[PDB]
């Protein structure tokens, strides 16, 4: 929406900050054991209930 | 006592969805996993049909008089080389059976001196049989703290508790030591088989005359 309340906006900000895979050096550090993040999502598929 | 968790495999939200859907009428997950089977013993993640119960009676009770008759029977078997050898002990070097040593032996305090006593009574070969016979047992018992299976060698019977000889012999492989009033079927017939290589002290034999009768 165009007209957002700040509280909702800050929950959207948190989801934006967490939506990313582990860095490449983490994959190296863990010998490829850690390659995915549970916070990884796509805006079209996994919907936030914000 | 052993058992499973009372709610194991029974706490998912599941229901049978009836006939007419082309699938078997076992209970299934209600939510997003829907068709996935649930609860029934034949389903993955289902309950165990007949698990162990902690209330199961494991103890086989025995009458006191009958238990004491068996203890006397097991004691008598320690006097026969045929029974002792058949149980698996080394009895070639033992001068006689029952093996009675003087009550002075109860003052021995060091394992080193008790070792000398065992050697001069011809008992050390049986202790060596137990030392060499310790093996790593086959199967899941290794995971549960039962890695080693050890043979039994000598039962030492002393007159009373807290004599020095108890501590001097209890570290030998396969050796058990008890005061005479503590004699029991666990030390007198390992495996449920009579005839245990036993070293009695003279004072223990005297005290025996008023016990288990």
């Amino acid at each position: 929406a165009r007209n957002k309340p700040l509280g909702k906006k800050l929950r959207l900000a948190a989801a934006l900050n967490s939506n990313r895979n582990p860095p490449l050096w983490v994959i190296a550090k863990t010998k490829r054991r850690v390659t995915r993040s549970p916070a990884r999502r796509h805006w079209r598929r996994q919907k936030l209930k914000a | 006592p052993k058992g499973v968790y009372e709610g194991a495999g029974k706490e998912h939200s599941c229901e049978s969805f009836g006939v007419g859907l082309g699938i078997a009428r076992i209970p299934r997950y209600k939510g997003h996993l829907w068709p996935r089977g649930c609860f029934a013993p034949n389903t993955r993640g289902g309950r165990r049909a007949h698990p162990p119960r902690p209330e199961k009676k494991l103890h086989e009770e025995i009458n006191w008089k009958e238990k004491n008759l068996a203890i006397r029977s097991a004691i008598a078997a320690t006097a026969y080389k045929s029974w002792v050898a058949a149980r698996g002990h080394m009895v070639e070097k033992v001068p006689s059976l029952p093996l009675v040593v003087s009550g002075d032996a109860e003052k021995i305090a060091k394992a080193k001196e008790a070792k000398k006593l065992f050697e001069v009574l011809g008992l050390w070969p049986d202790v060596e049989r137990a030392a060499e016979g310790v093996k790593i047992r086959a199967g899941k018992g290794k995971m549960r703290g039962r890695r080693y299976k050890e043979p039994k060698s000598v039962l030492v019977v002393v007159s009373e508790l807290d004599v020095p000889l108890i501590g001097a012999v209890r570290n030998f492989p396969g050796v058990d030591v008890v005061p005479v009033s503590h004699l029991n079927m666990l030390v007198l017939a390992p495996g449920g088989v009579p005839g245990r290589l036993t070293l009695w002290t003279a004072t223990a034999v005297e005290r025996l005359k008023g016990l288990f009768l």
Binding site: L6, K9, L10, L12, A13, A14, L16, N17 | -
Partner: protein, 81 residues
């Protein structure tokens, strides 16, 4: 209250052409507090403060310095450039 400076391509262009410094501050800072902090820390005069909250939840202030103080000179003095 100041967390860092913004030294992006847009921020540097606003420094040279409009005498503005761009800073990230605590999200609860107001325009009054931002102007006071900049004047106290850096001994400049603030003409006006424009603020926004970024989509990542950080408060950004475009701080326009008065007409006797250089935004480019202040960034150089601070050593953030």
């Amino acid at each position: 209250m100041i967390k860092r400076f913004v030294i992006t391509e847009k921020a540097l262009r606003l420094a040279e052409r409009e005498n503005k410094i761009t800073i990230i501050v605590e999200r609860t800072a107001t325009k009054k507090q931002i102007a006071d902090e900049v004047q106290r820390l850096y001994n400049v005069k603030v003409e006006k403060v424009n603020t926004l909250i970024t989509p990542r939840g950080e408060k950004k202030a475009y701080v326009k310095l008065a007409e006797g103080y250089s935004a480019m000179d202040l960034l150089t003095k601070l050593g953030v450039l």
